[PDB]
Amino acid sequence: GSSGSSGLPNSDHTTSRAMLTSLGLKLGDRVVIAGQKVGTLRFCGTTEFASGQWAGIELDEPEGKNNGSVGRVQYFKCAPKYGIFAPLSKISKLKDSGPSSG
């Protein structure tokens, strides 16, 4: 680990409990990144490369900028150029989306 870098203890303090229930997503559900990209939710929480709430989604087609793992840190397993990560806050449940008016 690293004492002087980010802040507050590690492991503990997880914000991945009051998000899945509030939003309505779970491991094994079809989500949508920004109501555009369609993928299957596999991992949900924080990332090691970036900062904030993310999720390791797995697109059905080869349109991802990863292969399940990011550099040295691993999240989920999948084919090459299939796994991708996007802001959970930006990832919502499939369907029920459409501003229309703008």
Curated annotation (Swiss-Prot):
<feature type="domain" description="CAP-Gly 1">
    <location>
        <begin position="45"/>
        <end position="87"/>
    </location>
</feature>
<protein>
    <recommendedName>
        <fullName>CAP-Gly domain-containing linker protein 4</fullName>
    </recommendedName>
</protein>
